[PDB]
Amino acid sequence: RGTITDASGFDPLRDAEVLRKAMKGFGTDEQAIIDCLGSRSNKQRQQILLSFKTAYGKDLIKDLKSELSGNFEKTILALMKTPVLFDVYEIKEAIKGAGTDEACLIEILASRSNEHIRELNRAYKTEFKKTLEEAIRSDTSGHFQRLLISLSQGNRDESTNVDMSLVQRDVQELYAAGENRLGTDESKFNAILCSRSRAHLVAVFNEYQRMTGRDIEKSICREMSGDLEQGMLAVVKCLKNTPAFFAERLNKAMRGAGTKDRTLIRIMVSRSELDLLDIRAEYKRMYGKSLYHDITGDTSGDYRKILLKICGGN
Ligand SMILES: [Ca+2]
Ligand SMILES: [Ca+2]
Ligand SMILES: [Ca+2]
Structure with a gap:
């Protein structure tokens, strides 16, 4: 892939x-x-x-x-850099200095597998003074900090068996934690979206749409704002269609007169040996023009050449 x-x-x-x-x-x-x-x-x-x-x-x-x-x-x-050490330094630079590159933290922690994230923790501790968790705490706050700490455990339920009795129960809880109440219980979203298995959460999203008539992503946009919102959506999107998620982040990195080069480099490099083929396909279906095409128009020189070399591959 x-x-x-x-x-x-x-x-x-x-x-x-x-x-x-x-x-x-x-x-x-x-x-x-x-x-x-x-x-x-x-x-x-x-x-x-x-x-x-x-x-x-x-x-x-x-x-x-x-x-x-x-x-x-x-x-x-x-x-x-190796896949693990490239992730390690990207997180470091995102937290480095003043300000935070929250999108990078979200992109990584929402897409990588349990096994890979467990390796990020060891590598981050080996390479730097702090642990990955300590690095997170320093640069994030609120329910968003909890979201990254949860994902940074690499402990999502890895089962693929779905229990509709528990899926429907999860749907009801999500409805009660946000849309069907004044205010939001962010912790209930966090626990369900971060700990439940992918096969389970996919069934939740379909059941949640059936009962409420609205997609879970709209409830999130209605209930949450700021980085917490972008975090939840990234998680849901990756659970649904990780290729489609990256394709969107690529498209947003290039649209406009400028270019988000850190993001563009990170995605192409970090997914080149995982699912960049699927990203490319998702990119064509969603925007009409090919990922290859939009790269040639937003970059130039040897920088563009290597990027396109990664897009085409071998
Ligand atoms: Ca509400
Ligand atoms: Ca909102
Ligand atoms: Ca020389």
Whole structure:
């Protein structure tokens, strides 16, 4: 379901030779870097990284970092991190400094699996002073902080069996926690949307629509505002259709005269080996133009080339 897969006939020491020749000497051969790194799975880029340092006793990442610049550099460095460590540094930068990149925290914590999130916690603690949870608490507050802490446990019910008796009970509780009352009990939404299984919550959304005649997402928009609202919707959307969710975030990152380059880079890189094919399909059905098309119009240069290389893949 991804666009980038293992390149066949693989030799990392040779790809390291390709990259050395592309950087050695005056000037830079940006096309050879893209043809190589962009056409290798992430695990293969790690072998290349180890072969590069073995052969020449230089740090590949350090050399690319000084050889390249701009958003083309950022895409390459993002490609060179492992899926877990790329997630780890994206969360760090989102919390870094003043302000918060809540959308990034939401995008990651709402889409990744239990197993992956458990690995984020270990990696975040290993790499940084704080734990993932302590990092969250510092930068978020209210019921939104609880939402991220809940998702950051990687403990969603992994069952696929649905009990309609409990589905209907969950629907009634959601109706009572928001739409059918003055005010909102955000905690009831949190516990149901974060702890219940995906097969269970999909049935809840369909049953909730049947009984109330309204989609759960509209109740959320009616009951909640701010980051808590965007968080809940992201969770529901990912439970429904994770590809369609990312396709929408991509579309919002490009529409306008400007571009959300951090988001654009993160999504293309982070989903390239998971479901970027499905994203592309969802993108075409929802907006008419292809994801490939909108990228060419919003980016340029080597930055666009590597992005499109990821879109097409292999
Ligand atoms: Ca050079
Ligand atoms: Ca209400
Ligand atoms: Ca609202």
